[PDB]
Amino acid sequence: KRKIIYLASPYGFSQQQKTLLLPPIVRALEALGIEVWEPFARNNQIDFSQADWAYRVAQANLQDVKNCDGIFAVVNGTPPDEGVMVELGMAIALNKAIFLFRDDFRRCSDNERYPLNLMLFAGLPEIGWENYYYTSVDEIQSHDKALYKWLTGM
Amino acid sequence: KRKIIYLASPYGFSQQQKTLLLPPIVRALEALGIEVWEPFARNNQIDFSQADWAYRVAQANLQDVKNCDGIFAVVNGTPPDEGVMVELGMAIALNKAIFLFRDDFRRCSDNERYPLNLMLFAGLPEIGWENYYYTSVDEIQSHDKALYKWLTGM
Ligand SMILES: O=c1[nH]cnc2c([C@@H]3N[C@H](CO)[C@@H](O)[C@H]3O)c[nH]c12
């Protein structure tokens, strides 16, 4: 019954960011009643001693995106992380709900409407796309933004 | 008397990174007795910079690298931050002490010795550069690593 969010981020690659940045974002999402699939935590059942572990991780994440209800993509950085971008593209083509997170104040875009490369927004509505665009962790729980509307049927 | 470290990083660009990742690194360096120059706070670079102010910021950082004793460069990301790289090149050419920090486990290099672009190591010794290369915040206080040895004369 709980909506499922795939929490796509590059924060698992750095010891500090995985330890400090991810838990507050997971907590905010769970506070909304969302079930959070965080792929760095989810893929620790893989045998990383066997040579094929990379393929198995790839397919597990592909399946998690097919089975989630929405993606919450941390698109910090210049540019955003390539694996997050692949996962985001998967979610767009599978008609998943799309939520984007960027608290990076640098401006790196190819157009004047959106704050990043326009293809990151291809799965969002023409009107109101910014309602799915989160620029601070405290904003995740805002009743005026899309995550909350999604959860309240509005 | 206190040695001066320029803490170069991209962590001031993100609100969560600025608030959560930087203070533990600053206090680890200060715990060794280092005067830490953290440019985002020092040069008040807290948002996007205006039409009369960005040249002064660049000059302040250039003078800070000229006046420091060493640089502590956070070279996480793929690739490392371009401004951190500019500041690092300044410190290399000015024969400053060089310390590098990367807790990102991803390999992204053009060579087999170094985990990053070989130019980042041009101010480090040929043999034993790993003593200046920190891969965890826990490691900063290590008496077997180059920062401590630098302060105590080995
Ligand atoms: O080594 C890995 N372990 C777990 N997940 C990933 C990923 C996936 N891609 C995303 C970032 O590259 C991340 O959110 C995760 O879903 C790439 N590499 C790894």
Author numbering:
A (entry chain A), B (entry chain B): 2 to 155
Which sentences did the original study use to describe this structure?
Nucleoside 2′-deoxyribosyltransferase (dNDT) enzymes catalyze transglycosylation via a covalent 2′-deoxyribosylated enzyme intermediate with retention of configuration, having applications in the biocatalytic synthesis of 2′-deoxynucleoside analogues in a single step. As with other NDT enzymes, the active site of CtNDT is formed by residues from two monomers, and therefore, it is only fully formed in the dimer/tetramer.
We compared two potential transition-state analogues for transglycosylation, immucillin-H (ImmH) and DADme–immucillin-H (DADmeH), as the distance between the bond being broken/formed in the nucleobase and sugar varies. Based on Scheme 1 and considering 2′-deoxyribonucleside1 as a substrate, releasing nucleobase1 and generating a 2′-deoxyribosylated enzyme, ImmH would mimic an early transition state in which the distance between ribose C1′ and the nucleobase is ∼1.5 Å, while DADmeH would mimic a late transition state, since the presence of a methylene bridge between ribitol N1′ (which replaces C1′ in DADmeH) keeps the nucleobase at a distance of ∼3.0 Å from these groups. Structures were obtained with the two potential transition-state analogues ImmH and DADmeH. The structure of bound ImmH largely resembles that of the clofarabine-bound complex, in agreement with the relatively weak binding of ImmH to CtNDT, and it is therefore substrate-like. For ImmH, ΔH was −5.25 ± 0.07 kcal mol–1, −TΔS was −0.36 ± 0.14 kcal mol–1, and KD was 78.2 ± 6.6 μM, while for DADmeH, ΔH was −11.43 ± 0.29 kcal mol–1, −TΔS was 0.38 ± 0.73 kcal mol–1, and KD was 9 ± 5 nM. ΔG was −5.60 ± 0.08 for ImmH and −11.05 ± 0.42 kcal mol–1 for DADmeH; therefore, binding is determined by an enthalpic contribution. Although no signal change was observed with DADmeH, ImmH binding led to a small fluorescence decrease in a single transient. Computational studies proposed the formation of an oxocarbenium ion in the transition state for the reaction, and D62 is equivalent to a residue proposed to interact with the anomeric carbon in this putative oxocarbenium ion transition state. CtNDTD62N, however, retained ∼50% catalytic efficiency in comparison to WT, and it is unlikely to play such a crucial role in transition-state stabilization.
